[PDB]
């Protein structure tokens, strides 16, 4: 419980979440933002194509010194990648949300990703020995992911007496 945002009329929505997942927060945020707002089946097929390296995930925020590719022209960018681990985690959550919607009885053809949110989980703190007998940090940045899918469904004016008189005079003068 306690999602970042919930749906009004929860009888038309299904939710899924995953916590403390050992996967890169920045890549996962990019993947979730690529998925944000799509139809569920279209999003799943797109993620399959990303795994097949036919399409790409555009990297918009965490993208310094990234290579450029022609597969970013679909989304009007130059920097895009294919994060397989993040795609697999998001695919698992999508499948779970679809299963929950099916158990609730919602129409699978009308489901769209109405909410998806990735934030930072507590860090996994390994350490590495380095030159001159130093200890440097060597950390994993895990993610909390959550998503909500949703079924798609298809003045007194106060006037002055002068204004009232003007309106009445116009009414008398006209038809």
């Amino acid at each position: 419980a306690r999602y970042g945002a919930t749906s009004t009329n929860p009888a038309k929505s299904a939710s899924a979440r995953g916590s403390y997942l050992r996967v890169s927060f920045k890549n996962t945020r990019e993947t979730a933002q690529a998925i944000n707002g799509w139809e569920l089946t279209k999003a799943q097929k797109y993620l399959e194509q990303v795994l097949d390296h036919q399409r790409a995930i555009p990297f918009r925020r965490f993208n310094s010194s990234i290579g450029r590719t022609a597969q970013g022209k679909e989304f009007g960018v130059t920097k895009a990648r294919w994060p397989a681990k993040s795609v697999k985690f998001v695919q698992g959550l999508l499948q779970n949300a679809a299963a929950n919607a099916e158990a609730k009885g919602l129409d699978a053809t009308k489901l769209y990703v109405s909410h998806i949110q990735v934030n930072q989980a507590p860090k996994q703190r390994r350490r590495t020995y380095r030159a001159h007998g130093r200890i440097n940090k060597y950390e994993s940045s895990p993610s909390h992911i959550e998503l909500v899918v949703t079924e798609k469904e298809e003045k007194v004016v106060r006037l002055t007496s002068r204004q009232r008189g003007r309106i009445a005079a116009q009414k008398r003068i006209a038809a």
Binding site: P122, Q124, R126, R127, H132, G133
Partner: protein
């Protein structure tokens, strides 16, 4: 037995997040190293290359 197993698995989580080799891994790091913070480098012998 399963309740005890779940209790142990819940107990392990902080050490696993700190990436310990196990319950026997109790390495301690100092706050600051004097050999790294004890330097005035004159024209002569140094402590490292």
């Amino acid at each position: 037995r399963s309740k005890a197993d779940r209790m142990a698995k819940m107990e392990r989580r902080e050490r696993n997040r700190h990436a310990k080799q196990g319950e026997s891994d109790r390495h301690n790091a100092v706050s600051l190293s004097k050999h790294l913070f004890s330097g005035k480098r004159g024209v002569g012998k140094t402590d490292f290359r």
